[PDB]
Scaffold this active site. Structure first.
Site, PDB file in Angstrom:
ATOM      1  N   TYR A   1      77.168 -33.109  -6.632  1.00 17.25           N
ATOM      2  CA  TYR A   1      76.696 -32.233  -5.576  1.00 17.25           C
ATOM      3  C   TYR A   1      75.379 -31.616  -6.069  1.00 17.25           C
ATOM      4  O   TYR A   1      74.911 -31.929  -7.169  1.00 17.25           O
ATOM      5  CB  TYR A   1      77.773 -31.191  -5.199  1.00 17.25           C
ATOM      6  CG  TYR A   1      78.554 -30.566  -6.346  1.00 17.25           C
ATOM      7  CD1 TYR A   1      77.995 -29.606  -7.187  1.00 17.25           C
ATOM      8  CD2 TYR A   1      79.876 -30.912  -6.565  1.00 17.25           C
ATOM      9  CE1 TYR A   1      78.737 -29.021  -8.210  1.00 17.25           C
ATOM     10  CE2 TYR A   1      80.616 -30.339  -7.588  1.00 17.25           C
ATOM     11  CZ  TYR A   1      80.051 -29.389  -8.401  1.00 17.25           C
ATOM     12  OH  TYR A   1      80.819 -28.835  -9.397  1.00 17.25           O
ATOM     13  N   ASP A   2      74.754 -30.807  -5.225  1.00 21.54           N
ATOM     14  CA  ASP A   2      73.410 -30.293  -5.473  1.00 21.54           C
ATOM     15  C   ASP A   2      72.402 -31.433  -5.655  1.00 21.54           C
ATOM     16  O   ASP A   2      71.400 -31.288  -6.346  1.00 21.54           O
ATOM     17  CB  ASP A   2      73.372 -29.317  -6.652  1.00 21.54           C
ATOM     18  CG  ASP A   2      74.271 -28.130  -6.451  1.00 21.54           C
ATOM     19  OD1 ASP A   2      74.410 -27.673  -5.295  1.00 21.54           O
ATOM     20  OD2 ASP A   2      74.840 -27.642  -7.464  1.00 21.54           O
TER      21      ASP A   2
ATOM     22  N   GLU B   1      74.380 -25.825 -18.697  1.00 23.28           N
ATOM     23  CA  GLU B   1      73.479 -26.416 -17.710  1.00 23.28           C
ATOM     24  C   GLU B   1      72.035 -26.206 -18.146  1.00 23.28           C
ATOM     25  O   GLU B   1      71.403 -25.235 -17.742  1.00 23.28           O
ATOM     26  CB  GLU B   1      73.784 -25.867 -16.308  1.00 23.28           C
ATOM     27  CG  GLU B   1      75.238 -26.186 -15.954  1.00 23.28           C
ATOM     28  CD  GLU B   1      75.592 -26.096 -14.505  1.00 23.28           C
ATOM     29  OE1 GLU B   1      74.758 -25.687 -13.678  1.00 23.28           O
ATOM     30  OE2 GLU B   1      76.744 -26.453 -14.181  1.00 23.28           O
TER      31      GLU B   1
ATOM     32  N   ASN C   1      73.809 -19.943 -13.743  1.00 26.02           N
ATOM     33  CA  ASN C   1      73.124 -18.681 -13.999  1.00 26.02           C
ATOM     34  C   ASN C   1      73.097 -18.313 -15.472  1.00 26.02           C
ATOM     35  O   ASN C   1      72.219 -17.578 -15.902  1.00 26.02           O
ATOM     36  CB  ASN C   1      73.784 -17.541 -13.226  1.00 26.02           C
ATOM     37  CG  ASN C   1      73.406 -17.523 -11.771  1.00 26.02           C
ATOM     38  OD1 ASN C   1      72.852 -18.480 -11.243  1.00 26.02           O
ATOM     39  ND2 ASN C   1      73.730 -16.431 -11.101  1.00 26.02           N
TER      40      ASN C   1
ATOM     41  N   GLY D   1      77.804 -22.237 -16.822  1.00 25.02           N
ATOM     42  CA  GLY D   1      77.430 -22.237 -15.419  1.00 25.02           C
ATOM     43  C   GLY D   1      75.928 -22.156 -15.234  1.00 25.02           C
ATOM     44  O   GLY D   1      75.182 -21.930 -16.186  1.00 25.02           O
TER      45      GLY D   1
ATOM     46  N   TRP E   1      84.611  -7.257 -15.683  1.00 21.58           N
ATOM     47  CA  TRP E   1      85.360  -6.092 -16.141  1.00 21.58           C
ATOM     48  C   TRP E   1      86.871  -6.280 -16.100  1.00 21.58           C
ATOM     49  O   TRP E   1      87.575  -5.646 -16.876  1.00 21.58           O
ATOM     50  CB  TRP E   1      84.976  -4.851 -15.287  1.00 21.58           C
ATOM     51  CG  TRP E   1      85.450  -5.008 -13.881  1.00 21.58           C
ATOM     52  CD1 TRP E   1      84.853  -5.736 -12.901  1.00 21.58           C
ATOM     53  CD2 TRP E   1      86.677  -4.522 -13.324  1.00 21.58           C
ATOM     54  NE1 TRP E   1      85.620  -5.733 -11.770  1.00 21.58           N
ATOM     55  CE2 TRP E   1      86.754  -5.003 -11.998  1.00 21.58           C
ATOM     56  CE3 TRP E   1      87.716  -3.729 -13.815  1.00 21.58           C
ATOM     57  CZ2 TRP E   1      87.829  -4.727 -11.167  1.00 21.58           C
ATOM     58  CZ3 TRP E   1      88.777  -3.441 -12.989  1.00 21.58           C
ATOM     59  CH2 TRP E   1      88.828  -3.939 -11.678  1.00 21.58           C
TER      60      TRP E   1
END
Ligand SMILES: CC(=O)N[C@@H]1[C@@H](O)[C@H](O[C@@H]2O[C@H](CO)[C@@H](O)[C@H](O)[C@H]2NC(C)=O)[C@@H](CO)O[C@H]1O
Length: 368
Positions: free
Chosen positions: A191-192, A119, A79, A77, A50
């Protein structure tokens, strides 16, 4: 050298000392600041929060304080998923809609470039045709940015991409050689590598393999990921080594087996500020009360446990080791996910503000 840092537009919603606000931005901490994330509506770049427009003015207002700073806007990203990217790249017409929207949006809000964070093409629901269509998207954007610079006389918009470390995703989605010709730099998400989706403990971001690893598992480390991207055609100068300011947590099956590779029953308990089972910010583990810390011998990174909770994370020492590594490999710099997961306000770790990211800046000899 570059130091590329991600800002996240949801860190403003954390409570107390963990709340990240514009005053916490340091105009001279990083060389490139990337805004996570924009989204997409009708194949056109769009805001996701917002007050993004307020934050864009803050963000690019840092450049008044440090005129050397470059800013980029990241789209996608984890999500965000893949469907909107798949639909946008499905035709030349839709890609053109997107590209034209992106140039206008970036200029309207005074960003210096776009960071692609799909992703991932070819995975997470995206079909195999998206590998070549992603190549075309990258080429389309690079070529259109070059054209706009010619027409406007303005400095050319930058194009980067955040890319995966694991061979499954790399080979499903990325014509590495081809896209490297068109990307200004490549933000390697080193990473991950392991996390609570696995049933045994493993480190988020180990530098090298363990002895017990073989097959594909033996490439789930930073060195292997870097070499993968270099050998597949990324110039070293364009490869930017990602660094995490968070760790990945597990609940152990038994508090009496705390090894790397010990059985786990799921995510670690959510952190008190980050509230996401399976991850913790650096400021949630750096002074973890009553915990036991040690280093994974061959992997050059720490883990820490307390009762049945186990966390693999990065500390000042591991960041120093990783910068020494990237310099030895001649890489273009470091990237960090994310500003708000370091102890940005110096409230927890008794190491001052931004202890991890200042380590990167110091080791890269980028201190003002
Ligand atoms: C450049 C980059 O690292 N991109 C990805 C990130 O999206 C991801 O961070 C995660 O982003 C989600 C939103 O897409 C958040 O809900 C989530 O909390 C966040 N996780 C962390 C640990 O910050 C990072 C890190 O996993 O990696 C990429 O996948």
């Amino acid at each position: 050298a570059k130091l590329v840092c991600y800002f996240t537009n949801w860190a403003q919603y954390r409570q107390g000392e963990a709340r990240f606000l514009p005053k916490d931005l340091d105009p001279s901490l990083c060389t490139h600041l990337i805004y996570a994330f924009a989204g997409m509506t009708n194949h056109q770049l769009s805001t996701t929060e917002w007050n993004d427009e307020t934050l864009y003015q803050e963000f690019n207002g840092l450049k008044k304080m440090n005129p050397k700073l470059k800013t980029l806007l990241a789209i996608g990203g984890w999500n965000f998923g893949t469907q909107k990217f798949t639909d946008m790249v499905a035709t030349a017409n839709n890609r053109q809609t997107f590209v034209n929207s992106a140039i206008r949006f970036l200029r309207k809000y005074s960003f210096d470039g776009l960071d692609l964070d799909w992703e991932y093409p070819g995975s997470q629901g995206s079909p195999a045709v998206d590998k070549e269509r992603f190549t075309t998207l990258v080429q389309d954007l690079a070529n259109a940015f070059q054209q706009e610079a010619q027409t406007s006389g303005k400095e050319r918009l930058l194009l980067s991409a955040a890319v995966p470390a694991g061979q499954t995703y790399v080979d499903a989605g990325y014509e590495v050689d081809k896209i490297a010709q068109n990307l200004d730099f490549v933000n390697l998400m080193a990473y991950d590598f392991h996390g609570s989706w696995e049933k045994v403990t493993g480190h988020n971001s180990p530098l090298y393999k363990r002895q017990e690893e073989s097959g594909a598992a033996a490439s789930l480390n930073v060195d292997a990921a870097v070499q993968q991207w270099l050998q597949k055609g990324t110039p070293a100068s364009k490869l930017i080594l990602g660094m995490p300011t968070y760790g990945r947590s597990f609940t152990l099956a038994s508090s009496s087996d705390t090894r790397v590779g010990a059985p786990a029953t799921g995510s670690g308990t959510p952190g008190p500020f980050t509230k996401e089972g399976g991850m913790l910010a650096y400021y949630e583990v750096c002074s973890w009360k009553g915990a036991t810390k040690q280093r994974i011998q061959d992997q050059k990174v720490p883990y820490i446990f307390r009762d049945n909770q186990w966390v693999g994370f990065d500390d000042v020492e591991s960041f120093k080791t990783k910068v020494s590594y990237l310099k030895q490999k001649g890489l273009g710099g470091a990237m960090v996910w994310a500003l708000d997961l370091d102890d940005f306000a110096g409230f927890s770790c008794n190491q001052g503000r931004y202890p991890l990211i200042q380590t990167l800046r110091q080791e890269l000899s980028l201190v003002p």
